[PDB]
Design a protein around this ligand. Structure first.
Ligand code: HEM
Lengths: 55, 446, 18, 419, 49, 33, 151
């Protein structure tokens, strides 16, 4: 790991929990709902916020 | 005396000659009691068919087993009579018979070397003696991880051309091969202009050319057709292959990108680059203070046991790439730090660092010319390659071409944003998936 | 036979002989 | 151009030079301190000393060296043997002087820093390992251990318990003892005599002192056997020949090329070699046999190093061995003698032609003789070999005490009493 | 032995510009890649608006 | 060290920001079509 | 296979007393064929032990002719019963081909330790002889075990 920028702030080695996380080969689309929950969650909080300002 | 430029100037120059049927002659005089006499044929594997595949390396053995006039092991006892060593070797594009001997015995030398080239006793007594030895060598040749992994590399990049195949060919042909094809293969590819004679030593020219002369004037060595010239450009297939085997201790890798052929201006520029990136091995006395940026890093942590860069140029085609060994947990970190080098060349290179590359080439080029045979051996391939040209002093003149803008315009072609050819031999497992590598060739400016 | 043998340490390459 | 000019100094250090036409310009420096000069507590030093050439000089930092040499594009080498360590250095026609400048500082002005020594320790194992992959190595080093007592038996490599045992003092003492201006030889190739002649007298003049010669090597009987798992036995069988610089030392070289088989034809099983042929008749499928001859200052050894399978090993030796007796019985052919001598002339001249190969043989005479002998003289000395001399010489091998070493599966191996 | 390996035909998957065995890939290469990126860069236009 | 490249490149990225930065807000301007 | 690494652990703690390691070399010098064999497994041989090798060497050199069963505190008949039952197998026996053939030799070894050890041996006679008794007389004349602590 020579001058790999993934060590230098430690926090990015915590961010190799995504990028090199090994996965199976064959995966049906049915496993996409892993993410689509998250994004449906984020998209709330924002749009959930800008309602609060006028409520 | 001798100054660097002056030392170029006094050298015995190339001599050239013709015979009528297309054979060639050439020579040099070193004022030396010993001489190399040899023969260089262009008959390769890339000519041979799918059934004839491997026949070439097969023939290569039989020549010294006895011949038309001098049966089995009568021949050798004359070579050992002179005390002259005797040698032969093959290559995909070439085949070479040559002898190192005293200048005195030259009269027999050629006349011996003459016979072997064409008249060959072919006796199935020898064949079955032979067909074992090869079927002995094939299975063993697994034992050397190096020689194998290359045979992966061609086949994976060039698939679908006569160049894409093994020298010795698959095992099954070795069994089925009958001397019918040989005689046919003999008949086809051994005529002149294909053939070339050369020599260097106490010989001068004349005293050779008379005893060049009569067989072979000669046994012909003919010129008719055999069509022309069975040769045709080859495709470049960006691909990958992995032989994944987890027993073995270490894991080889070879990565390569395609490059130009023999005669071409860019052939020099790239000679220099692969000097700059340099090479490291386990056992050097370099340490951590070496200049080669991959010989400093990979020596620090021993990220890889050893690696060398190779450069191979075929007729119309050439290969650029490195070969490195490292332990399996470590393989990723080579690949990155490698692609650091190629990519920092094609943009950020520098005048100063060029010199240490430029010098070494002048060094190795010259020191390659010590000794009888290494000179002669060069002359042989050159004629088939660049024509007569032995542009010794011109080399230097061609080097001073090299400039900062020369390199970065050259390597911008062949490296930046291409399709590599990866071939590897287990425990490969950590070697990244393909679409990483392709995404590692081109900086996004990071 | 052998020379008998030798060794070459140096810097740029490295090897052993006989 | 001009031929060899070698010049003693008052100091006794020989110098010699030629002037070439080539851009190739190379220097070499030979020293008499080899393995035979390591002492009991002194072991493993030379094999360390040979790796330390890149360390910090007295005047120049170890960094400035290594970057420096490569910038020029030079090359530095080191070589050892049981006798003469040689620092070889080579570069282009022009730049030699800067490089001639470093060559001294390494051997002239060493400094060993305890923190720069300890870091190098682990390197030995890495070095030692890649050396013994060819057991044809590992057979030999045992051999000398069987055939001597005091000196020559020393290894060219550092025994293992001795690894962490190398103190800088040991180095720094062995430096000055066996380095001296009497024992050193400086040889140029492509460079003018005077330039070479100048600098050498300046820096390389020190003492005096110490050649200490106390090694007579005392050839003495013995044998060594070793049991490993490998399926291919190796074997050596040796009796004491005579010292270098004798018609005998010439005679043995005649004798080998009669029997001694290097391949002269690729893949060709050598039919001219009586030995390999005399065996193959009465025996079976793969094996190999070769004569083995090496000569040193005070003595030299002669024998034959064989390889076989576990079963054949017993016969292979007895077969080949009695074959020598035949020659000791008077059986001879003058043409082979005439044939062999031709091989010798061949083997020697083709060996010399290459500059480096030439360069070595130059000083090889120097530290031994101090003169130069043109190859013509060698030739005329070659043919002086008498027939009965060859026979009589071979009659010494059979008639005198012998030694052996073997590494592999030994189950069928004979001992030296059965021979 | 090992050399018995030989590569299967992928012709079905290729596109015919590179189909021939006797041709230099370097002629089509320029445009051949030039299309793929055009897809990518085009896409980013949409996201951008 | 007298950086040779990266003088051209940065000049593009300087536009890449500003041109883009003009495109984000883009109030007054000259050309239309 | 799980038991393999155990050997090294066993072999190591054995040779801490070189007075061990001197002996095993000694027999190797004084014989050729049989007795020179080690009581421990040479190192290259470690991963080389196949079950078959065991399972063959079991039945070859185990046999009801070559075995002896000795009780101490137990009645003869109980002991006498079970032994005849289970321990009766073959036959086969005894593979005596080792005459050991005493034969000259010596072995020397160079280690860093500061204390030399040495053994010097000539061939005595076989067990079960007045000589084998006589030597035992001869040692206690010269042969010194400490009979008085620190004495
Ligand atoms: C998992 C996350 C959330 C869920 C499932 C959620 C769900 C809802 C639902 C079902 C309503 C009623 C819908 C309607 O009345 O039309 C609502 C209203 C509201 N949410 Fe959330 N919400 C989430 C996050 C948030 C967040 C993060 C905020 C504030 C930052 C927020 C603030 C509000 C407010 C102020 C309302 C009342 C506005 C309205 O209902 O019209 N919500 N939310």
């Amino acid at each position: 790991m020579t001058n790999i920028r993934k060590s230098h702030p430690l926090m990015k080695i915590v961010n190799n929990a995504f990028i090199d996380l090994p996965a199976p080969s064959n995966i049906s689309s049915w496993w996409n709902f892993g993410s689509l929950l998250g994004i449906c969650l984020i998209l709330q909080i924002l749009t959930g916020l800008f309602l609060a300002m006028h409520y | 005396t001798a100054t660097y430029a002056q030392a170029l100037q006094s050298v015995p120059e190339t001599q050239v000659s013709q015979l009528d049927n297309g054979l060639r002659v050439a020579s040099e005089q070193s004022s030396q009691p010993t001489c190399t006499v040899g023969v260089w044929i262009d008959a390769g594997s890339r000519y041979e068919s799918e059934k004839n595949n491997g026949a070439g390396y097969f023939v290569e053995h039989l020549a010294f087993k006895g011949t038309k006039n001098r049966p089995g092991n009568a021949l050798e006892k004359e070579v050992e009579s002179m005390g002259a060593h005797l040698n032969a070797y093959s290559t995909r594009e070439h085949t070479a018979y040559y002898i190192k001997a005293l200048s005195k015995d030259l009269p027999k030398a050629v006349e011996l070397l003459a016979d072997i080239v064409q008249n060959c006793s072919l006796e199935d007594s020898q064949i079955e003696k032979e067909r074992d030895v090869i079927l002995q060598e094939l299975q063993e040749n697994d034992t050397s991880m190096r020689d194998v992994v290359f045979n992966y590399l061609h086949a994976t990049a060039f698939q679908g051309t006569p160049l894409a195949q093994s020298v010795e060919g698959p095992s099954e042909n070795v069994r089925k091969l009958s001397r019918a094809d040989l005689t046919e293969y003999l008949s086809r590819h051994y005529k002149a202009p294909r053939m070339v004679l050369a020599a260097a030593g106490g010989l001068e020219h004349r005293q050779l050319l008379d005893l060049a002369q009569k067989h072979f004037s000669g046994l012909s060595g003919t010129y008719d057709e055999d069509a022309v010239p069975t040769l045709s450009p080859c495709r470049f297939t960006g691909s990958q292959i992995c032989h994944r085997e987890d027993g073995l201790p270490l894991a080889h890798v070879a990565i390569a990108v395609e490059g130009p052929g023999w005669a071409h201006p860019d052939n020099v520029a790239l000679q220099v680059a692969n000097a700059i990136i340099g090479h490291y091995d386990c056992t050097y006395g370099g340490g951590a203070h070496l200049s080669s940026p991959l010989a400093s890093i990979a020596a620090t942590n021993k990220l890889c046991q050893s690696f060398q860069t190779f450069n191979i140029c075929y007729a119309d085609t050439g290969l650029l790439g490195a070969h490195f060994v490292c332990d399996h947990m470590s393989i990723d970190d080579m690949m990155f730090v490698l692609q650091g080098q190629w990519m920092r060349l094609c943009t950020s290179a520098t005048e100063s660092e060029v010199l240490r590359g430029k010098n070494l080439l002048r060094n190795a080029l010259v020191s390659h010319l010590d000794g009888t045979t290494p000179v002669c051996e060069d002359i042989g391939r050159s004629l088939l390659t660049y024509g007569r040209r032995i542009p010794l002093a011109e080399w230097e003149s061609r080097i001073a071409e090299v400039d900062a803008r020369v390199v970065r315009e050259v390597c911008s072609k062949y490296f930046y944003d291409q399709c590599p050819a990866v071939a590897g031999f287990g425990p490969i497992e950590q070697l990244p998936d393909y679409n990483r590598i392709r995404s590692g060739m081109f900086w996004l400016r990071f | 036979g052998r020379p008998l043998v030798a060794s070459v340490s140096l810097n740029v390459p490295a090897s052993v002989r006989y | 151009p001009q031929d060899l000019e070698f010049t003693r100094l008052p100091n006794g250090l020989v110098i010699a030079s030629l002037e070439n036409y080539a851009p190739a310009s190379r220097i070499g420096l030979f020293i008499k301190a080899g393995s035979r000069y390591e002492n009991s507590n002194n072991l493993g030093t030379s094999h360390l000393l040979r790796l330390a050439s890149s360390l910090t000089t007295k005047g120049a930092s170890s960094f400035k060296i290594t970057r420096g040499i490569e910038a020029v594009g030079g090359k530095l080498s080191v070589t050892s043997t049981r006798e003469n360590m040689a620092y070889t250095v080579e570069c282009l026609r022009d730049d030699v002087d800067i490089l001639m400048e470093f060559l001294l500082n390494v051997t002239t002005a060493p400094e060993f820093r305890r923190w720069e020594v300890a870091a190098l320790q682990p390197q030995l194992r890495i070095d030692k390992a890649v050396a013994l992959q060819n057991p044809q190595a590992h057979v030999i080093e045992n051999l000398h251990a069987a055939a001597y007592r005091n000196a020559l038996a020393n290894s060219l490599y550092c025994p293992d318990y001795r690894i962490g045992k190398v103190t800088p003092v040991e180095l720094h003492d062995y430096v000055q003892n066996h380095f001296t201006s009497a024992r050193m030889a400086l040889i140029g190739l492509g460079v003018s005599h005077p330039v070479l002649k100048q600098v050498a007298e300046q820096f390389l003049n020190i003492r005096g002192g110490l050649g200490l010669s106390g090694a007579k090597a005392k050839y003495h009987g013995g044998e060594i056997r070793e049991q490993n798992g490998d399926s291919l036995v190796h074997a050596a069988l040796v009796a004491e020949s005579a010292a270098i610089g004798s018609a005998e030392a010439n005679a043995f070289s005649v004798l080998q090329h009669v029997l001694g088989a290097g391949p002269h034809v690729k893949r060709g099983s050598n039919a001219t070699s009586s030995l390999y042929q005399a065996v193959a008749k009465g025996v079976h499928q793969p094996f190999d046999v070769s004569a083995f001859n090496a000569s040193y200052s005070d003595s030299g050894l002669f024998g034959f190093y064989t390889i076989s399978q576990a079963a054949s090993a017993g016969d292979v030796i007895k077969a080949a061995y009695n074959q020598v007796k035949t020659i000791a019985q008077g059986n001879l052919s003058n043409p082979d003698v005439q044939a062999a001598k031709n091989k010798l002339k061949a083997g020697y001249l083709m060996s010399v032609e290459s500059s480096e190969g030439f360069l070595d043989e130059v000083g090889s005479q120097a530290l031994a003789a101090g003169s130069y002998t043109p190859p013509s003289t060698v030739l005329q000395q070659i043919d002086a070999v008498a027939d009965a001399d060859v026979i009589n010489a071979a009659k010494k091998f059979v008639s005198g005490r012998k030694s052996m070493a073997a590494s592999g599966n030994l189950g069928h191996t004979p001992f030296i009493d059965e021979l | 032995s090992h050399t018995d390996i030989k590569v299967p035909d992928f012709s079905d998957y290729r596109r015919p510009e590179v189909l021939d065995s006797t041709k230099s890939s370097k002629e089509s290469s320029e445009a051949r890649k030039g299309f793929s990126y055009l897809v990518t860069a085009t896409t980013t236009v949409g996201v951008a608006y | 060290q007298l950086a040779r490249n990266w003088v051209p490149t940065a000049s593009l990225w300087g536009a890449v920001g500003a041109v883009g930065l003009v495109w984000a807000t883009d109030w007054r301007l000259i050309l239309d079509w």
